Scaffold this motif. Structure first.
Motif, PDB file in Angstrom:
ATOM      1  N   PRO A 108       0.825  -1.224   0.000  1.00  0.00           N
ATOM      2  CA  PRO A 108       0.000   0.000   0.000  1.00  0.00           C
ATOM      3  C   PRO A 108       0.851   1.262   0.000  1.00  0.00           C
ATOM      4  O   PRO A 108       0.446   2.264  -0.589  1.00  0.00           O
ATOM      5  N   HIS A 109       2.040   1.206   0.604  1.00  0.00           N
ATOM      6  CA  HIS A 109       2.915   2.370   0.595  1.00  0.00           C
ATOM      7  C   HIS A 109       3.452   2.617  -0.803  1.00  0.00           C
ATOM      8  O   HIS A 109       3.472   3.762  -1.280  1.00  0.00           O
ATOM      9  N   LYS A 110       3.894   1.555  -1.467  1.00  0.00           N
ATOM     10  CA  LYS A 110       4.449   1.678  -2.812  1.00  0.00           C
ATOM     11  C   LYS A 110       3.385   2.229  -3.777  1.00  0.00           C
ATOM     12  O   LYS A 110       3.664   3.091  -4.612  1.00  0.00           O
TER      13      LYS A 110
ATOM     14  N   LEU B   9       0.268  14.672   6.429  1.00  0.00           N
ATOM     15  CA  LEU B   9      -0.222  13.517   5.704  1.00  0.00           C
ATOM     16  C   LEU B   9       0.847  12.984   4.774  1.00  0.00           C
ATOM     17  O   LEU B   9       1.578  13.751   4.134  1.00  0.00           O
ATOM     18  N   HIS B  10       0.962  11.659   4.715  1.00  0.00           N
ATOM     19  CA  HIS B  10       1.886  11.046   3.799  1.00  0.00           C
ATOM     20  C   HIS B  10       1.624  11.548   2.381  1.00  0.00           C
ATOM     21  O   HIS B  10       0.469  11.676   1.957  1.00  0.00           O
ATOM     22  N   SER B  11       2.701  11.808   1.652  1.00  0.00           N
ATOM     23  CA  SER B  11       2.602  12.204   0.246  1.00  0.00           C
ATOM     24  C   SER B  11       1.824  11.204  -0.623  1.00  0.00           C
ATOM     25  O   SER B  11       1.692  10.006  -0.292  1.00  0.00           O
TER      26      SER B  11
ATOM     27  N   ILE C 282       8.676  -2.341   6.586  1.00  0.00           N
ATOM     28  CA  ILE C 282       7.904  -1.633   7.615  1.00  0.00           C
ATOM     29  C   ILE C 282       6.895  -0.677   6.977  1.00  0.00           C
ATOM     30  O   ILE C 282       5.739  -0.634   7.391  1.00  0.00           O
ATOM     31  N   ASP C 283       7.322   0.082   5.963  1.00  0.00           N
ATOM     32  CA  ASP C 283       6.398   0.988   5.243  1.00  0.00           C
ATOM     33  C   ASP C 283       5.152   0.268   4.721  1.00  0.00           C
ATOM     34  O   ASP C 283       4.040   0.765   4.845  1.00  0.00           O
ATOM     35  N   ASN C 284       5.352  -0.899   4.119  1.00  0.00           N
ATOM     36  CA  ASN C 284       4.248  -1.604   3.492  1.00  0.00           C
ATOM     37  C   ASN C 284       3.416  -2.469   4.433  1.00  0.00           C
ATOM     38  O   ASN C 284       2.273  -2.813   4.093  1.00  0.00           O
TER      39      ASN C 284
END
Ligand SMILES: [Cl-]
Ligand SMILES: [Cl-]
Ligand code: NA
Ligand code: NI
Ligand code: NI
Lengths: 89, 90
Positions: free
Chosen positions: A30-32, A86-88, B8-10
């Motif tokens: 989800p971060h990527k 907020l995260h970009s 950790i990010d994901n």
């Protein structure tokens, strides 16, 4: 309070094979995802940009832009000043 | 190759509230973390040293010291000799 990852996880079993591939990517990275274009996701998953857009619209009314917005709420906040936002996306 | 910050990010969105507090600190201050003890991080975050150790073991099997070792691979290398590099300290 709504949670897009909760929704996708629980709707996932009824998705098509291709929808599952896209959804699993979102759930696992989800971060990527929040800093990828739909074309970039399509190439990574060997599918079309259109397919990324259609599944986004299926899970949230505002489609891909809104998916990334919603995801960003569940990502780490970023430091504004090194002495949060907020995260970009 | 593996990347602990990538992991950790994901994984972050599914962590508990307390785990997220710890993980956000690691992600936002990874350089600061490598030269802190778990007690120091706990005091910074108003949480327990045990919760830091537990989160560390959750993300890497060697726990807190291994977390710092892995983080150091992604930090700047340090000068060995100042003439007109080495793995960052932990
Ligand atoms: Cl769930
Ligand atoms: Cl990432
Ligand atoms: Na995946
Ligand atoms: Ni980030
Ligand atoms: Ni340093």
């Amino acid at each position: 309070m709504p949670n897009i990852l909760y929704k996708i996880d629980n709707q996932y079993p009824y998705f098509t094979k291709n929808e599952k591939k896209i959804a699993q990517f979102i759930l696992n990275y989800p971060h990527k995802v929040v800093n990828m274009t739909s074309q970039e996701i399509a190439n990574q998953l060997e599918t079309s940009s259109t397919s990324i857009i259609r599944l986004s619209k299926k899970v949230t009314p505002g489609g891909f832009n809104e998916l990334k917005t919603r995801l960003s709420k569940f990502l780490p906040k970023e430091v504004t000043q090194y002495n949060n936002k907020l995260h970009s996306r």
